Curated annotation (Swiss-Prot), chain A:
<comment type="subunit">
    <text>Binds to host ACE2. RBD also interacts with the N-linked glycan on 'Asn-90' of ACE2. Cleavage of S generates a polybasic C-terminal sequence on S1 that binds to host Neuropilin-1 (NRP1) and Neuropilin-2 (NRP2) receptors. Interacts with host integrin alpha-5/beta-1 (ITGA5:ITGB1) and with ACE2 in complex with integrin alpha-5/beta-1 (ITGA5:ITGB1). May interact via cytoplasmic c-terminus with M protein. May interact (via N-terminus) with host bilirubin and biliverdin, thereby preventing antibody binding to the SARS-CoV-2 spike NTD via an allosteric mechanism.</text>
</comment>
<comment type="function">
    <text>Attaches the virion to the cell membrane by interacting with host receptor, initiating the infection. The major receptor is host ACE2. When S2/S2' has been cleaved, binding to the receptor triggers direct fusion at the cell membrane. When S2/S2' has not been cleaved, binding to the receptor results in internalization of the virus by endocytosis using host TFRC and GRM2 and leading to fusion of the virion membrane with the host endosomal membrane. Alternatively, may use NRP1/NRP2 and integrin as entry receptors.</text>
</comment>
<protein>
    <recommendedName>
        <fullName>Spike protein S1</fullName>
    </recommendedName>
</protein>
<feature type="region of interest" description="Integrin-binding motif;">
    <location>
        <begin position="4"/>
        <end position="6"/>
    </location>
</feature>
Amino acid sequence: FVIRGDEVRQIAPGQTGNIADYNYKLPDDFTGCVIAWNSNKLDSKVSGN
Amino acid sequence: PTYGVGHQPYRVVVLSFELLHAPATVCGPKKSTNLVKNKCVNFNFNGLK
Amino acid sequence: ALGKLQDVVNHNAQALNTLVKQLSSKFGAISSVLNDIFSRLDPPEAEVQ
Amino acid sequence: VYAWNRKRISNCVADYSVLYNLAPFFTFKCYGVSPTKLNDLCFTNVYADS
């Protein structure tokens, strides 16, 4: 998925947030890895994406 | 403003509390329920469960 | 005269009183109350406490 | 920082969820309490040092 730059802390187990609660929730016993990278070059437009 | 991160000004606010050892005056948005007598209930009094 | 029997009663009562008293020990945790630990910390560190 | 401002917070109901759920703050780091449990607890001796 694509989120904001500041919202990367909410992609974690046990977090309360807006994308955490209403978009993507992780379990408390979650195992795995979260990968985040900037996509300004591809997922942005001058007129607004 | 021309300096890189690590030298830019940061605003820091430190919130200091005490835990449950006095009557409390600052509380969360949780709504108060009615009180029931002589029955087994799981209660929350000012953060004490 | 009857010190031996009273002594046995005293040891049993004293052992129970000590066992009850031991619940008031933090044991190197932030609090001696379990409910406070749940009400205050995230499960990764609350599990440790 | 040498003359840091201390404000007492008392006799109010505090919604920390609007502080936590808003995204502009880079560091929100708590030591003696969980960040997500602040809405479920009652406090006194609350001070903001700015």
